[PDB]
Design a protein around this motif. Structure first.
Motif, short mmCIF file in Angstrom:
data_model
loop_
_atom_site.label_atom_id
_atom_site.label_comp_id
_atom_site.label_asym_id
_atom_site.label_seq_id
_atom_site.Cartn_x
_atom_site.Cartn_y
_atom_site.Cartn_z
N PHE A 139 0.80 -1.21 0.00
CA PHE A 139 0.00 0.00 0.00
C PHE A 139 0.84 1.27 0.00
N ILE B 86 -18.27 -4.26 -12.66
CA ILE B 86 -17.95 -2.85 -12.79
C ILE B 86 -17.84 -2.66 -14.30
N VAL B 90 -14.22 6.04 -14.18
CA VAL B 90 -13.33 7.07 -14.70
C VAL B 90 -13.43 8.39 -13.94
N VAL B 91 -12.28 9.05 -13.81
CA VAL B 91 -12.18 10.33 -13.13
C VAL B 91 -11.50 11.30 -14.08
N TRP B 122 -13.32 -6.07 -16.54
CA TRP B 122 -12.36 -6.23 -17.62
C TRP B 122 -11.62 -4.91 -17.72
N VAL B 123 -10.31 -4.99 -17.89
CA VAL B 123 -9.49 -3.79 -17.97
C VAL B 123 -8.44 -3.96 -19.06
N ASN B 127 -3.33 -0.96 -19.10
CA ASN B 127 -3.85 -0.05 -18.09
C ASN B 127 -3.30 -0.42 -16.71
N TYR B 134 -7.05 -1.85 -8.66
CA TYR B 134 -7.94 -2.98 -8.42
C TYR B 134 -7.27 -4.04 -7.56
#
Ligand SMILES: CC(=O)SCCNC(=O)CCNC(=O)[C@H](O)C(C)(C)COP(=O)(O)OP(=O)(O)OC[C@H]1O[C@@H](n2cnc3c(N)ncnc32)[C@H](O)[C@@H]1OP(=O)(O)O
Ligand SMILES: CC(=O)SCCNC(=O)CCNC(=O)[C@H](O)C(C)(C)COP(=O)(O)OP(=O)(O)OC[C@H]1O[C@@H](n2cnc3c(N)ncnc32)[C@H](O)[C@@H]1OP(=O)(O)O
Lengths: 157, 157
Positions: A139, B86, B90-91, B122-123, B127, B134
């Motif tokens: 972390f 999920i 996004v930010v 799924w990513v 990324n 995650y």
């Protein structure tokens, strides 16, 4: 099934304290060198943590029982950082409930809570406690010093 | 300050703010050129239609700066059952690295945790930033299809 609920401990009544002690004793079994011996040590430390940082006392619950907890202090002065920083005073999960991601949930909760107040989080962990140190490093915590059987770790924003 | 709330209505204002966030986070969808916003729009509308009860947004003031789409009713043939999912997360780039994503994910897990013991997503294979986040939340890589990696978080008994 059963939900793992993370919530702020609203009050430290004799009942709650008893549960926290059980969790503490269960989790520190085998690590008495750092957790101390007897329920008295646990009782006194937990009371001290509550008085010092009740506002950041989070408990993990599965049903009506507390299975783990973490004590987050947004107002801790560190002589090493020479200023107020965030601190983790205690962090433990019932032995029977370990390895199930509960500690991770409590730590994330702690980081989110302290993140609103401090740009630095400090903690001390036993030198033989490789498990906790592994979790902390994952972390972002880094070892930065030592004091006897204790290792100091810090996380910066 | 940052506020997390369930989106109650996908009106024009919210939709355009969501498209702005999506476009920012996914660097303009340049492959679509001038139709970028149209592609983002249709995808957001789809997410809203499929999982509105798990559509959370992060707001700084009265503007949406990030969002996460949580689906408590997703059938996964990989898991062979209904699981949580999920769909999007996004930010806005100007607001990244401030803990908003963490807050949205905590909200997501809290929500889905009431219904599912498993969460699937799924990513993109490149990324690394999202995968790292995650993994900190307990997700594990378990498969891949094309340029997409499947990750799962399963709560143990
Ligand atoms: C400031 C301090 O208070 S330091 C004192 C910390 N407390 C203690 O040592 C008390 C005894 N230990 C405990 O109560 C617990 O083991 C805790 C709180 C350290 C960890 O919580 P748990 O719920 O057991 O762990 P959780 O299931 O969430 O997983 C923790 C993650 O950290 C790491 N980790 C935890 N324990 C270990 C271990 N023994 N060995 C290796 N890695 C470990 C892993 O990366 C694990 O993730 P994974 O399951 O994906 O591999
Ligand atoms: C199912 C799917 O939807 S997969 C699609 C996921 N989404 C995307 O790829 C869209 C593009 N990305 C984004 O919008 C965002 O980057 C998100 C949603 C992945 C993450 O949200 P953010 O608000 O940026 O992240 P947040 O601030 O909560 O924390 C991220 C952690 O990531 C890394 N990170 C973020 N910014 C930095 C930085 N400046 N320096 C170092 N590490 C950083 C760190 O590990 C940071 O550490 P901390 O947790 O110790 O603070």
């Amino acid at each position: 099934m059963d939900e793992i609920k993370i919530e702020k401990l609203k009050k430290l009544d004799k009942k709650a304290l008893n549960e926290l002690i059980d969790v503490y004793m269960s989790g520190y079994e085998g690590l008495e060198e750092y957790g101390g011996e007897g329920r008295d040590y646990a009782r006194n430390y937990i009371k001290w943590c509550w008085k010092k940082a009740s506002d950041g006392f989070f408990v993990a619950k599965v049903g009506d029982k507390i299975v783990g907890f973490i004590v987050c202090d947004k107002d801790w002065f560190s002589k090493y950082e020479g200023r107020i920083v965030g601190a983790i005073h205690e962090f433990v999960v019932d032995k029977k409930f370990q390895g199930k991601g509960i500690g991770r949930k409590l730590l994330i909760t702690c980081l989110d809570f302290l993140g609103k107040y401090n740009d630095t989080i400090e903690l001390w962990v036993g030198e033989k406690n490789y498990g906790a140190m592994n979790l902390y490093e994952k972390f972002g915590f880094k070892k930065v010093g030592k004091s006897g059987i204790w290792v100091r770790m810090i996380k910066r924003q």
